[PDB]
C-alpha cells in the first residue's frame, strides 16, 4: 500500500524515453537501488513475494517504475518448504513493475558459509521426572560447610 511517490536526487541516466534514478521516497521511507522489497501476490492468501530493487526510472508510457529481481522460498523449489521461514533462494526471475505495488521495505542479507562451531552440550530447563514437567533450573545454594562436595540433587531429595 503506497500512494505518495517522489524521486530523490537528479536522474542518473536518461534514455530520452526513460529517466533512471538512484533513490525514491515512498510515503515516509526512502528506498534506493539495491534494497529489497515485499509485494503482495495476486492471490492475497499466498506468502509475500520478495525482490531486490535493481533499477528505478520514470517512464513516459508507464509512469514511476522499478525492476524487481525476485527471490524465492523453498516451496517454490523441488525442496518444498524450508525449516526457517526467513530462508530465501536466489533465482533468475525478473519483472518491471509500478512502484505503487511495493508493500513494504524489507531486509535481506547474505549468510556466508560457516564452520562447525563449538560442539558442546548445553541445558536450559530442569525436568521433574516424577510429575513429567519442565521448570527453570532450581537455585538451591550450598553452604560454606558442604561446598566442597555439594550436589544440588542430593540436597533437594533429602
Amino acid at each position: 500500500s503506497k500512494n505518495r511517490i517522489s524521486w530523490v536526487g537528479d536522474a542518473v541516466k536518461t534514455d530520452g524515453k526513460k529517466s533512471y534514478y538512484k533513490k525514491v521516497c515512498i510515503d515516509s521511507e526512502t528506498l534506493e537501488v539495491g534494497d529489497c522489497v515485499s509485494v503482495i501476490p495476486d492471490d492475497s492468501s499466498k506468502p509475500l513475494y520478495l525482490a531486490r530493487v535493481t533499477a528505478l526510472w520514470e517512464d513516459s508510457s508507464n509512469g514511476q517504475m522499478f525492476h524487481a529481481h525476485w527471490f524465492c522460498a523453498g516451496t517454490d523449489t523441488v525442496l518444498g518448504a524450508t525449516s526457517d521461514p526467513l530462508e530465501l533462494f536466489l533465482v533468475d526471475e525478473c519483472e518491471d513493475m509500478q512502484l505503487s505495488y511495493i508493500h513494504s521495505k524489507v531486509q535481506v542479507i547474505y549468510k556466508a558459509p560457516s564452520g562447525a562451531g563449538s560442539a558442546t552440550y548445553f541445558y536450559q530447563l530442569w525436568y521433574d521426572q516424577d510429575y513429567a514437567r519442565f521448570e527453570s533450573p532450581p537455585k538451591t545454594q550450598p553452604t560454606e560447610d558442604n561446598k566442597y562436595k555439594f550436589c544440588a540433587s542430593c540436597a533437594r531429595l533429602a
Binding site: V39, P41, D42, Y49, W70, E93, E95, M97, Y101
Partner: peptide
Amino acid sequence: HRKVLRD
C-alpha cells in the same frame, strides 16, 4: 513468464 498480473 511473469508473476504479477494485477491492474
